[PDB]
Amino acid sequence: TTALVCDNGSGLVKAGFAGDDAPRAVFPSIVGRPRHQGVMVGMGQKDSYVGDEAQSKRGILTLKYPIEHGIITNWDDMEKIWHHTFYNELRVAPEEHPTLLTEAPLNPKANREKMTQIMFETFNVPAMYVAIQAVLSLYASGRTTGIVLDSGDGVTHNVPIYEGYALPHAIMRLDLAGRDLTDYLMKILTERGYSFVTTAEREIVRDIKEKLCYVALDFENEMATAASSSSLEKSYELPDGQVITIGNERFRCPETLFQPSFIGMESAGIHETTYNSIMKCDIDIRKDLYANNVLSGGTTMYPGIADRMQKEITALAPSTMKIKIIAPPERKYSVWIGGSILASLSTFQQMWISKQEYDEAGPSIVHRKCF
Amino acid sequence: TTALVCDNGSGLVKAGFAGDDAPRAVFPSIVGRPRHQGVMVGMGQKDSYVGDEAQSKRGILTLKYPIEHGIITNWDDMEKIWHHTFYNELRVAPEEHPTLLTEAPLNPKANREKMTQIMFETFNVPAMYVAIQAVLSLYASGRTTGIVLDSGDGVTHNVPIYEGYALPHAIMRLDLAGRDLTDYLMKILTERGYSFVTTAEREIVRDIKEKLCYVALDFENEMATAASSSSLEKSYELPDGQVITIGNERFRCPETLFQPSFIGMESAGIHETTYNSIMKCDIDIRKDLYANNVLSGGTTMYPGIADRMQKEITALAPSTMKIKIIAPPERKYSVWIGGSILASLSTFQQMWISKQEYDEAGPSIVHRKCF
Amino acid sequence: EAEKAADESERGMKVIESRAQKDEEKMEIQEIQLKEAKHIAEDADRKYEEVARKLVI
Amino acid sequence: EAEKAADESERGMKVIESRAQKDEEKMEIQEIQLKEAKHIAEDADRKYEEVARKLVI
Ligand SMILES: Nc1ncnc2c1ncn2[C@@H]1O[C@H](COP(=O)(O)OP(=O)(O)O)[C@@H](O)[C@H]1O
Ligand SMILES: Nc1ncnc2c1ncn2[C@@H]1O[C@H](COP(=O)(O)OP(=O)(O)O)[C@@H](O)[C@H]1O
Ligand SMILES: [Mg+2]
Ligand SMILES: [Mg+2]
Questions:
Q1: Which residue positions does Methionine (R)-sulfoxide occur at (chains A, B)?
Q2: Which of A155, A240, B106, B271 has its CA 20 to 30 Å from the CA of residue B350?
């Protein structure tokens, strides 16, 4: 039979059968209970709208993501999300399909063990396998080397790989991602008068960020230009009218990636954690990693980031090496495409964690040889 | 049929069919298992890359030479190297070709006996013969007398020969060679800030030594000049950029040959062990040995050694004798050229150790008349 | 109309990127050949100077 | 959707054209230096042969 390539993610759940080009169903991972009282009788009001249904009734819900930073903080809601994904968005019972979840690097063990225990006890799948979210993004590019920066919505991690041999001592995981950029944008919009507070209006700020923000090639020049002319002010229409005008908030929101001091984080930007991740590698594979830097994940879709990052790394790196940044147009679904490719391989067909194996060793089987 | 003139050496395996001018395939003798984990599936990752393949993937391997000082310390790896040499670099099955290995003087017996046992049992050659590495280098020069200093990469030995009669009591074998010079160079580079530690970076230090180092004609004058001017500082580009500048480390690395006290060895340099080897000979053949001093082996390729050695010996020797140092341009492959010449001789065709002879007397046949 | 324009631009972009990548690979091969030529030149120069000095002596 | 696709296509075409021109320049200079180095190598080999013969004499 065919395998189910699910990809929990944090912000958008992407799923679909193995062997295709794009995920079959992509929908936000939010579960929102209603918060008001409700007076109409017999309206058929449910107790929790999940997935894309709660992005249409969000006016009277309190949306809450069940995955904070890669890790899962609310297991009941995550179980509800998985149940919805299997039964309503794909309509395939899990009793007859292997599953291939994905997990960020350096995550707590208990999260992974609970994930496998749920998949084997509640949904009762035949066999499931958990894979690191960066190796798949490297599969999708058709490479076999390269250092991949997978800046998702929950957590940004940077896994270097050479000739198929991952370097476990050079993984640099940073917890700045799309959600913190949404919060920072929502915080700097208040400098013009627009106040978004409700958890429903966070979605509106996210839409503003997606449609308007861009990464500046040079920060100081843009700050000077936006403060003199008015060629940058782009307007946007809220879900009820009252258009708003975003000035130099456009390139200040995604600039936080390269200067995490804006949101008070100490660490260095995504332009310098990649160079540090390279320098921890051996001295003889640094040229190949320099030449095959891969971008993935949703947050790396800002217009103009593949040039800013290349300029920064070229500034840091030695002058002789060639710096090349692979930015495929299908960046958002790169991890899932790689997952489909991996699940479609014949050599991989014996790596699944078969159910009888789980019955013999318990949920701690995932840390064992079947990784 | 044609004979296979293999030459194990220590650092570069040189092989080729008898009767040519140069070895057909020359490649480092290193076997390196991968050391990291490896995440790509189906990449076709082997368990051990040998020969010149492991000098390209050396970034993720742990290269380890199977021959320490002439002697062989790891028989499985040496067998793997021989198998590679026969099947992939020459592509001739050994069942139909005699072999002519080479061995340093004064080596342990068990090494030679195990070598012949392997060649007769595993590879199943028709007949093999083991020859001393210095007599061949004397063949290649077209002489019949002379004292040859064969400073390889493993061990430096100095065999005097007169009129074809070797003098077994005058062989002076010293264990300083190219590898110790590489280690000493890697140790003195730390005085400028460059630290090479990994077994892969030893190859980079070896390349630095080959391309930059030279032997000073007079040591103190060079030490004084390099400490005042800056006309010696030559720069070199690492495999990733960050050029380095070598100062008076250039002529201090190969100076260890003439003053083995630098690496803590007690013995006298290669300039004085040759004179001692001569003085042990009889009083009537010393003039001929003085006039026909032969250099061979890789490590004697330093620019300016054929003058320093002549100056030193002229200082030691009596003033009347003429000191001449034969330094052919084809020094590196001198032993193998001599091996080809010896294997191509008709008079030598009955000295091979035929397989039936080995079956009758066991591996200890090599010490017998068939030397 | 916009769909047609986008598809045409996509096809042009893909073909030009493919040709650029292939010519880049060939350029890398050319650089390797140039490096080998440099090494050969240096080695031959050393040969010549050494032989001339020996002849003088 | 079409507007965004067109913008991204334009930017990609720009960057690919720039990289292609860079590659063409690199190929040209590599070929030039390669030919010069090969001629120098020929000269060095010829000089080496002549001086070696004179040295034997
Ligand atoms: N076109 C876009 N431009 C800018 N940001 C985007 C775009 N699309 C998605 N994002 C950001 O990326 C996030 C989605 O990232 P995604 O790759 O789905 O995360 P995950 O790894 O959890 O799947 C969204 O929250 C949004 O903030
Ligand atoms: N051109 C060169 N200049 C200086 N040193 C060299 C040069 N070529 C080789 N060497 C040294 O000689 C060693 C090779 O010696 P070789 O004669 O191959 O040893 P073996 O007797 O085991 O074959 C290398 O390890 C290197 O350190
Ligand atoms: Mg992701
Ligand atoms: Mg030798």
A1: 40, 43
A2: B106
